[PDB]
Structures are given as C-alpha cells and as structure tokens.
Amino acid sequence: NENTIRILISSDPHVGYGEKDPVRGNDSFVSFNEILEIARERDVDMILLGGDIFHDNKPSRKALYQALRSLRLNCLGDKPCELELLSNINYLDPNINVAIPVFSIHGNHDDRYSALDILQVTGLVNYFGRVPNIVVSPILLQKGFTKLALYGISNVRDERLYHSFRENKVKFLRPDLYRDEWFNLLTVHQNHSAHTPTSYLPESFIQDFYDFVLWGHEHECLIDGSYNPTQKFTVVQPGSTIATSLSPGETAPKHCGILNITGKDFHLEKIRLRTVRPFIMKDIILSEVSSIPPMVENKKEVLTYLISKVEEAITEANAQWYEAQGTVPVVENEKPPLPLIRLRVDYTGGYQTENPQRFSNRFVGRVANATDVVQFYLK
Amino acid sequence: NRRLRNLGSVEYIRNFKKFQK
Ligand SMILES: [Mn+2]
Ligand SMILES: [Mn+2]
C-alpha cells in the first residue's frame, strides 16, 4: 500500500558466531542471509536492526565478506525506494542502486571505527543512533500520508545509561512541523531486566510520546510484543537469528517480523526463520522422577531416564524443523540439520551421575553439540 | 524504578532514489 511503511525487523544476527565449529560454522552467515532474503521476497520498504550485527569487535575477513555479500545481493536493485527523506542515507546516493535500505544501531558487540562504520562506508547499511550527554535525533521518512520518526540509541554500559536518565541527561529531540502526525519508533540495545537496580533500562524511563520500541540485545524471541499501559507504547523484542549460548531464553523459536505502519496504526506480522538450527532444552529434577529410587546405586536407572529424554528432545527438534520448512520426512526431502540438545539435571536427594562428555558421546552424529548434551547441578 | 516515569527531556526542533545507469 502507497501509505503503508513496511519494515523488516530483526536484531542480534551475530555474524561470525561459531565460525570455527565444524558442524555450526556457517549458521550465522546462512541466517543473516535469510533475514535479507525474506526482506527482498516480501518487498518491504526498509530493514531495521537492533544491533550486535557482528559477533566479534574485529570481525574475521570471512564474516565481513559474508555480511557484505548478502547485503549487496539482497539490498541492491532496480526496485524504487518509495521512502522520502524529510530530515549520508545510502539510497540517496546517485552511484549505488539501493532497493532496500538497512538501518541499524550498534550493540555492545559491535563496539573510533566500528565494523558498522565499514558496512556504512560501502553504502550497504545506514548506521544510526550514535552515542558520542545523550542527544536522540530522528530520521524522518514519508510514504504517502504516513510519517515515520525513527530514533535510535546505540548500546551504552547499562549503569551509565541508567545514571544518565536519572541525572536527566538524555535529550529526546522531536520535529515541530507535523507535531502529532509522526509514528515514533525507538530502537535500543540494552538489558530489559537484570538483578541489579542500575544494570538495565526500565520501560517507564522511556518517553510516552513513543508508539513502538524495538528491543535489541535480548536474544529470546518475544516477537508478539508487549503493551505498556502507563507509557502507551508496544515493545517488540524480536530476538537473535542464532543461539549464542544454550540458555532457556535461546530455545524459543527464532523469528523476524514485518512492521506495517499506516498513519499512527501498525500491524506486526511474525515470520518463522527456516535456517535456524533446532534447539531443545529439558529441565529435569531427579527427585521428581518416581521411577528412580533415591539414595541407592541408581546410575543405571538415572541413565535410562536421561537417554529417553534426549531421544524425546531429538524427535521434538526434528518435528520443529519440518514444521519450519512445511515439509515431511521422505527420501526426496532435505533432512533436518543436527539439533542442539541440552538437559539441565538437578541431582539433589541422592542420585548417581555420568561424566557429561561420556554421556554426550552416546549421541555422536545425532546432535550438533556432541560435547555438552547434559549439565548436572545441585539446587 | 517502577515508580518514576518519563526520565530525561522531550524537546521540539525545526521513486525517491537517484541511481539510473
Ligand atoms: Mn547479542
Ligand atoms: Mn548485546
């Protein structure tokens, strides 16, 4: 639609993560490529990223090459950009045919010349929301009657930003012309909630004039979003495009989204990422497993139960992948990649265990993390 | 933290491509 700004939203691709792993080495490149491919196939007006583009502060030559190759092949082309800039931006360059402009803030992993400066200098990404006293200035875009005021705050040490907000040292700049017509979009890369009272960014701290908050840094996919009643805005945490640890947060299926803006209204469409390796986690408390009698030489029974839980997790992972592809397990069809499987086992109350590497070895050629399938702990 | 709100300050200020071949 001529009055609908269509933005592909994602965050935390971590290009280069696990590059050296023989099984997982290409995951970050394939999934960062997927995000750009979906944007092109779905004919969006622009891409908006929430930071942590590269895993390493100084990306490897392979990581940089792969990111540049994907951006060049998916973002350049004959497609006209229908976004009018009201207040340099790559699509306005007369020597580069930008079909889909990419906008990104920096995260803490992409810390004078960041890897993001390199993406910008090539004309492939618009690095915005720089934090050199913080002055948050918008990028003003128009498509028909729709007016977008895009704001960004690049990653700042959580305590430093929290103190800056407390000492009222954060300056949000608003356009005077077409005052209340602008759809206000904020992009951040901070902790959404931490044990420390100063290590995170509370939602209440964010100005209520904002309509939408794109929340980077947090890897868990919470793509459906959450409404803040006091501030009157809807926070969307798209999550990462790769699991950077085997944490419970990393298990939620990865998605990107299309944010459709018509006037001051929006429609968020969620898109399941097909290239993300399945990750299943099981949290087990042995004392809650009646089958296993406590305080006796129960290794055999502990092992039988845990082996059955890995098997169950593999079956769920394979099913999760076929679901993502819209396919069935048949000879003509591509087979799922090896899944990431993790059992967290609480062994309190008298239960014998097994060496984690010896346990993991029981699933060689069946799991992507053949070294750390199980973790035994005491509550 | 849940108490304070709207921290900092809020103040006011005053085809589309050029490629061809
Ligand atoms: Mn990250
Ligand atoms: Mn981060």
**Tokens 């009643």 sit on residue:** A229
Tell me the three state secondary structure of residue A21: coil
Beta-bridge mates of residue A135? A171
**Residue A361 labelled as part of a binding site:** no
CB contact under 8 A, B1 and A82: no
Q: What is the DSSP letter of A258?
A: E
Ligand 2: distance of its center to the CA of A327 in Å?
Answer: 34
Pairing mode, strands A5-10 and A46-49: parallel
Q: Is A168 on the interface with B (CB under 8 A)?
A: yes
Strand order in the sheet with A374-377: A279-285, A340-346, A374-377
Nearest-Cα distance to chain B for A88, in Å, is 13
Query: What residue has token string 């990431």?
Result: A340
Cα A153 versus chain centre, distance: 17
Question: How far apart are the CA of A52 and the centre of ligand 2, in A?
Answer: 6
Q: A40, exposed or middle or buried, with CB in 10 Å at 0-12, 13-18, 19+?
A: middle
- Alpha helix ranges (H) inside chain A: 27-41, 61-75, 115-121, 158-166, 299-325, 356-361
Q: Is A189 one of the annotated binding-site residues? A: yes
Chosen for mutation from A84, A139, A205 (greatest number of chain B CBs closer than 10 Å) is A205
Q: How far apart are CA A48 and CA A103, in angstroms?
A: 5
CATH 3.30.110.110 range(s) for chain A read: 278-379
Which residues in chain B are followed by a discontinuity, with C-to-N distance exceeding 2.5 angstroms?
14
Taking the C-alpha atoms of residue A76 and residue A80, their distance in angstroms, rounded to an integer, is: 10
What is d(CA A44, CA A83) in angstroms, rounded to the nearest whole number?
A: 11
Q: Which ligand is nearest to the CA of A249?
A: 1
Buried b (16+ CB within 10 A) or exposed e, A339-372: bbbbbebbbeeebeebebeebbebbeeebbbbeb
Which CATH code for domain A1-277? 3.60.21.10
A179 touches chain B (CB under 8 A): yes
Residues of A with CB below 8 A from B14's CB?
A: 175-177
Instruction: Place domain A278-379 in its CATH homologous superfamily.
Output: Mre11, capping domain (3.30.110.110)
Phi, psi of A208 (to 5 degrees): -70, -10
Q: How far apart are CA A320 and CA A330, in angstroms?
A: 16
Q: Within a 10 A sphere around the Cβ of B10, how many other Cβ atoms?
A: 15
Is some CB atom of chain B closer than 8 A to the CB atom of A98?
yes
The 10 Å Cβ neighbour count of residue A192 is 18
Site from B2, B3, B4, B10 to mutate, A interface, most A CB atoms within 10 angstroms:
B10
User: Range(s) for CATH 3.60.21.10 in chain A?
Assistant: 1-277
Nearest to residue A98, comparing CAs of B4, B11, B20, B2?
B20
